[PDB]
Design a protein around this ligand. Structure first.
Ligand SMILES: C/C(=C\[C@H](C)C(=O)C[C@H](O)CC1CC(=O)NC(=O)C1)[C@@H]1OC(=O)/C=C/CC/C=C\C=C\[C@@H]1C
Ligand SMILES: [K+]
Ligand SMILES: [K+]
Ligand SMILES: [K+]
Ligand SMILES: [K+]
Ligand SMILES: [K+]
Ligand SMILES: [K+]
Ligand SMILES: [Mg+2]
Ligand SMILES: [Mg+2]
Ligand SMILES: [Mg+2]
Ligand SMILES: [Mg+2]
Ligand SMILES: [Mg+2]
Ligand SMILES: [Mg+2]
Ligand SMILES: [Mg+2]
Ligand SMILES: [Mg+2]
Ligand SMILES: [Mg+2]
Ligand SMILES: [Mg+2]
Ligand SMILES: [Mg+2]
Ligand SMILES: [Mg+2]
Ligand SMILES: [Mg+2]
Ligand SMILES: [Mg+2]
Ligand SMILES: [Mg+2]
Ligand SMILES: [Mg+2]
Ligand SMILES: [Mg+2]
Ligand SMILES: [Mg+2]
Ligand SMILES: [Mg+2]
Ligand SMILES: [Mg+2]
Ligand SMILES: [Mg+2]
Ligand SMILES: [Mg+2]
Ligand SMILES: [Mg+2]
Ligand SMILES: [Mg+2]
Ligand SMILES: [Mg+2]
Ligand SMILES: [Mg+2]
Lengths: 159, 205, 294, 169
RNA sequence: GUCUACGGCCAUACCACCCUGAACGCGCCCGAUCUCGUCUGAUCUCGGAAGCUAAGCAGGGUCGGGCCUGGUUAGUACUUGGAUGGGAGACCGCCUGGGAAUACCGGGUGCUGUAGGCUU
RNA sequence: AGCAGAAGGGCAAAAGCUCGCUUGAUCUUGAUUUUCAGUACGAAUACAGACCGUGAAAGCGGGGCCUCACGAUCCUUCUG
RNA sequence: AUAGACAGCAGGACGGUGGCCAUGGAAGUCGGAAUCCGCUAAGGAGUGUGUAACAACUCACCUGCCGAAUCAACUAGCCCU
RNA sequence: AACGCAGUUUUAUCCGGUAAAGCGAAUGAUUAGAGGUCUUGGGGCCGAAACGAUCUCAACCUAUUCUCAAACUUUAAAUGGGUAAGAAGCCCGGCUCGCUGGCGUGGAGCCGGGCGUGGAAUGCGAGUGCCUAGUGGGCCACUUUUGGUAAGCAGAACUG
């Protein structure tokens, strides 16, 4: 039976990367977090206050509260056979913006913008993404050069 | 005494080296890993013969010692007491354990150190002999005898490298003439065409 | 050959350099973090700080706020701008610090149209003053002093610039404890002593002190003051006129930009082909050198 | 010819009296060092506890002071006069400094006092060139360039030039 | 072309040794009356402007170390899923997909934001 | 190196050392995390309201750099 | 290996020299290192038997008869121990 | 004439330190030879009255070299974990605040209007409450995996 220690097994998890120790770069604190945005939780061992528990490291949540140094995040946590929406407070050193949400939010603007130009021009711009279709037909020019003949090589005992 | 080697033939446990967590390990049977003329210059012993393991098993320190003695003894008979150089390329670092059962049961069964073995991979070289080309037949025959001290299948392979270096024999002489291989005792030093030009100056001075 | 080379290849492999401005010894990131970082529940509200940097021959006063791409300067005042307002010499004295602090305060409030609304202390007493906001008017500009790597002992010139901005009308939290009038013995602050330092009287007493005993050292210590025909007697009124000039027209007039043809003063980076050729030349000369010698 | 900023000078002179015990001797030793320089010295404690030397940890066993400027120059002259303006070649460190010892302090033109006693002291001279303070300033702290560094030979020559001293092998 | 102040990223920026540096700056530098602090005006604080780029700093150099990046290593090692595959076993091969890391060999050696300055 | 201790993580104008001042180891209501049944205890995180310390100030601090160092009902005892 | 192999049937297997050290004995043949040269078809610083040392036999090497393939090592299938 | 969902992929993005690898990279372990040789010791010799000269062996340093790590690591997979893929969205105008504030600043809330190409694939109708029995000795197989010489042995992970 293992211990119930709050930081058991986080030897490598909360360690700093190689040659990345020391002062926390200040753009970390300059980020702006507002209610409703999506943040990636990643505990950093340099700051021991406002640590997320190890079960929330590598998880993504939604900010619901903002305080002087920390944010309240709603994170989905699977508890045996149920998923709970856990409300955790973590200092902003241990979070960062989820680029996935940022990329999607950009596409919504682009879709909405592209729709306005589709009305003033007739043309139908494709908005929905499509899975990689089967490759269409094409020709392959030999350009005079005959394809190189490949043969399996004899076995060589390299020890 | 020792259990039969069949009880520790397979790499069944994680590596368990002699460390601060594993105290009281008896010293391995094999202590001398290099024998013959270790000092012979790189160019004196170009021919190299290797005994290569064909199984993923454990070789005991006693087994390594017996083969070393067996190969050494024959090479002295066939080439001379200084006509070669033998290096054992396996060091027994894996500690095997024994749960001493002296007339309780399996309670607290974690054993005590018994000896050391060398976990060998398929294709890992077990021992190497470098000598003159005229003594190739003896090096195969000497390594053939040492094969009978080990469990499992072993293969004898005459290396195309020069001696105990990592450079091909057919091009070793050319690289030495072009100063890309400076003889450094037993082996050679590779001269990269980089680094301060002063080093190039000395070499060509 | 006895000592293990500490500066060996593994030493450099594992070496983590500090931040560039820490390596340069310019910024204290421990204090920087506490200075420029805003509370997250204030979002994009800027946190303005007053940068005061006393140099060998100049005083730099700036108002800045932090952004990810870098700090933004909204107002900068320099001590070398004081000759326009009257002060020709002593540009790095406590009196010049007060003027540079006053100049930055008026220059900023003038850019924000707050100068007419907030005047500060027009007449200097050296006492404790704090500008308070007026109801129905925009609130007083609030910034925090950034002393950088300076030691904040009493009488530090960064507090001189702080006094100038405070009297200029900028709301900066502070206490009189670090002004020159503060007495560490009685734990009492003397406003009159502060005013003498602000008006440059300690420099005035110094110049009088030299002229009495050693005229030769007086010329050595104040040669440029003698050149600018400024005397201990006229020092106070010189700064009184300077404060009037600053409060009158604090606007900065950028130096007329004059185009000049591009000129290169430093060597550019050598090309790889040149570097390869240089090594090839060196080797060829080396072989000939042995050829002629042998 | 030579840059005026490459001139060697006395950065400081460090005077140390290691009495080896706390009590009457250290207090009197401080008075010797105080009246030799005019500066109140400071007491150095023992980092270890050595039974052989009879010293315990955190026990004041030595008295030392640092002197600079003209006062350090003139005290140095008294020291070399006692040493007859001659030093062994090995007295010079590889960092361009050198030092010597004085067996009796009254050899330095100091009147002996029965209620004080006679004392020996250690003299260390730290040389330097203008600009060495960049390694000591808080802001924009910099490390001196290789050429500025004073080599052992240039410390020995400076001693021969200034005090026309003698270097013994 | 470049500096100063404040920076963001935090070595492509570090480290060693060297060469060069107009202008302005940054410096070193001179001094201790005042402020302030020291065993020591060295540091720190303050008041300056005789000298110097010697140093710092800046640019450049070096078959330089490091770092960054690419190749090779190598479809190798390892691996998802599959078989009434082989083998006494140890282990191995194949099918289905994924796919590294040294040594070794090339290339690079800070970018940039705000404000102010300098370069007929 | 050190940071009381086991170890692991973290830390260099500091979290180490030395010095100065202090009592944020104080008063109070909730929320949350950890074990989890998602109960309790313990411990912890982020706030809020008082009253304070420190610093020029930003700010930091309601115990120890973080991960352990502890205890229901009934009863007794003390305080308002 | 048709410029004659392999097998078989027969001859030579020499001089320096009993090469050096060592050993009581060591003359190719107890041991350790050197393992070279006129002489041809070849003969060695010897593959073995043998002697206290010799001697002697014998082997590689080469020739006569012969007239088409043959020799050595290794490897892995089934089978066998 | 669809409300929504998923033991699944795709797209985007984040997480990780196992496999492997590495040790001429840190920590720990470990074989050999080579070159330096300042100092440090020994052997030994000249000198021998004194240093002194000189050689060797070690130690020590430098560049190489053999072999390793569950409780080492610069690197670093495969499989895997989280989140997002819109109408609770977007866009425009206005208002409230005792919070915040140089600034109708920042933030939040509220009100009105406008806009459907329902903004990846595939499949499926979902949501929600009450009462509730039995069970709470398990065992086996692939692959991973601990102790043990091993066990039709003891103990885990995953799916069946
Ligand atoms: C252990 C005891 C105090 C505990 C804090 C406590 O609360 C005990 C509790 O009341 C026990 C009850 C609780 C329960 O709900 N009902 C039961 O009736 C018993 C006492 O410790 C001693 O002072 C002496 C200790 C020495 C040993 C001898 C006697 C213990 C006396 C003290 C009763
Ligand atoms: K466990
Ligand atoms: K445990
Ligand atoms: K310079
Ligand atoms: K406060
Ligand atoms: K290692
Ligand atoms: K039950
Ligand atoms: Mg704490
Ligand atoms: Mg096991
Ligand atoms: Mg075998
Ligand atoms: Mg500070
Ligand atoms: Mg005393
Ligand atoms: Mg000075
Ligand atoms: Mg120069
Ligand atoms: Mg390089
Ligand atoms: Mg690469
Ligand atoms: Mg610790
Ligand atoms: Mg501090
Ligand atoms: Mg507990
Ligand atoms: Mg509070
Ligand atoms: Mg605390
Ligand atoms: Mg067969
Ligand atoms: Mg059979
Ligand atoms: Mg792990
Ligand atoms: Mg491994
Ligand atoms: Mg690796
Ligand atoms: Mg039920
Ligand atoms: Mg039930
Ligand atoms: Mg039961
Ligand atoms: Mg059970
Ligand atoms: Mg069973
Ligand atoms: Mg079982
Ligand atoms: Mg059972």
């Amino acid at each position: 039976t293992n211990t119930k220690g709050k930081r058991r097994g986080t030897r490598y998890m909360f360690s700093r990367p190689f040659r990345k120790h020391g002062v926390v770069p200040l753009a970390t604190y300059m980020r702006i977090y507002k209610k409703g945005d999506i943040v990636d939780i990643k505990g950093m061992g340099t700051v021991q206050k406002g640590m997320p528990h190890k079960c929330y490291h590598g998880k993504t949540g939604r900010v619901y509260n903002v305080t002087q140094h920390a944010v309240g995040i709603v994170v989905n946590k699977q508890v045996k056979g149920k998923i709970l929406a856990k409300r955790i407070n973590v200092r902003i050193e241990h979070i960062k913006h989820s680029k996935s949400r940022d990329s999607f939010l950009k596409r919504v603007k682009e879709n909405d913008q592209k729709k306005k130009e589709a009305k003033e021009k007739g043309t139908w711009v494709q908005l929905k993404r499509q899975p990689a279709p089967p490759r269409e037909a094409h020709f392959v020019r030999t350009n005079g050069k005959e394809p190189e003949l490949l043969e399996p090589i004899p076995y060589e005992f390299m020890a | 005494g020792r259990r039969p080697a069949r009880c520790y033939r397979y790499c069944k446990n994680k590596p368990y080296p002699k460390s601060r967590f594993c105290r009281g390990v008896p010293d391995a049977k094999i202590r001398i890993f290099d024998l013959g003329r270790k000092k012979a210059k790189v160019d004196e012993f170009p021919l190299c013969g290797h005994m290569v393991s064909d199984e993923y098993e454990q070789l005991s320190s006693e087994a390594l010692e017996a083969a070393r003695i067996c190969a050494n003894k024959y090479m002295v008979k066939s080439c001379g007491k200084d006509g070669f150089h033998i290096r054992v390329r396996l060091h027994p670092f894996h500690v095997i354990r024994i749960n001493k059962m002296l007339s309780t049961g399996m309670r607290g069964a974690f054993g005590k150190p018994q000896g050391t073995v060398a976990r060998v991979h398929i294709g890992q070289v077990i021992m190497s002999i470098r000598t003159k080309l005229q003594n190739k037949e003896h090096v195969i025959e000497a390594l053939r005898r040492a094969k009978f001290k080990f469990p499992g299948r072993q293969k004898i392979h005459i290396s195309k490298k020069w001696g105990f270096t990592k450079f091909n024999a057919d091009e070793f002489e050319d690289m030495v003439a072009e100063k890309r291989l400076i003889p450094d005792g037993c082996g050679v030093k590779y001269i990269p065409s980089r680094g301060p030009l002063d080093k190039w100056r000395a070499l060509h001075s | 050959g006895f000592v293990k080379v500490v500066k060996n290849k593994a030493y450099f492999k594992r070496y983590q350099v500090k931040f560039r401005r820490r390596r340069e010894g310019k910024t204290d990131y421990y204090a920087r973090k506490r200075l420029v970082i805003q509370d997250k529940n204030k979002y994009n509200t800027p946190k303005y700080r007053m940068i005061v940097r006393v140099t060998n021959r100049d005083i730099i006063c700036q108002i800045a706020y932090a952004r990810i791409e870098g700090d933004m300067i909204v107002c900068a005042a320099y001590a070398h701008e004081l000759p326009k307002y009257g002060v020709k010499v002593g540009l790095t004295n406590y009196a010049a610090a007060y003027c540079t602090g006053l100049l930055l305060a008026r220059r900023l409030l003038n850019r924000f149209g707050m100068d007419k609304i907030y005047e500060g202390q027009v007449e200097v007493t050296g006492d404790e003053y704090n500008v308070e906001s007026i109801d129905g008017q925009p609130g007083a500009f609030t910034c925090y002093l950034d002393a950088g790597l300076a030691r904040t002992t009493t009488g530090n010139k960064v507090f001189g610039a702080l006094k100038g901005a405070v009297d200029g009308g900028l709301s900066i939290p502070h206490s009189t404890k670090r002004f020159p009038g503060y007495d560490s013995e009685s734990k009492e602050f003397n406003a009159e002593v502060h005013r003498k330092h602000i008006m440059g009287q300690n420099v005035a007493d110094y110049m009088r002190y030299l002229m009495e005993e050693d005229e030769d050292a007086y010329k050595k210590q104040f040669s440029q003051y003698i050149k600018n025909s400024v005397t201990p007697d006229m020092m106070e009124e010189m700064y009184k006129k300077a404060h009037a000039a600053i409060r009158e027209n604090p606007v900065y007039e950028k130096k007329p930009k004059k185009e000049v043809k591009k000129k290169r003063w430093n060597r550019p980076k050598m090309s790889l082909a040149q570097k390869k050729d240089r090594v090839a030349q060196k080797k060829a000369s080396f072989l000939r050198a042995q050829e002629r010698a042998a | 010819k030579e840059n005026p900023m490459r001139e060697l000078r006395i950065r400081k002179l460090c005077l140390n009296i290691c009495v080896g015990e706390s009590g009457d001797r250290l207090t009197r030793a401080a008075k010797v060092l105080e009246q030799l320089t005019g500066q109140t010295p400071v007491f150095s404690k023992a980092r270890y506890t050595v039974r052989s030397f009879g010293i315990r940890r955190n026990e004041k066993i030595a008295v030392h002071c640092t002197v600079r400027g003209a006062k350090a120059e003139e005290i140095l002259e008294k020291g070399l006069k006692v040493r007859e303006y001659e030093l062994r070649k090995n007295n010079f460190s590889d960092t361009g400094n050198f030092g010597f010892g004085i067996q009796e302090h009254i050899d330095l033109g100091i009147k002996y006092d029965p209620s004080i006693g006679i004392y020996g002291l250690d003299f260390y001279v730290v040389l330097g060139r203008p600009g060495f303070s960049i390694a000591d300033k808080k802001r924009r702290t910099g490390c001196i360039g290789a050429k500025h560094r004073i080599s052992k030979e240039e410390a020995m020559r400076w001693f021969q030039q200034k005090y026309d001293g003698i270097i013994l092998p």
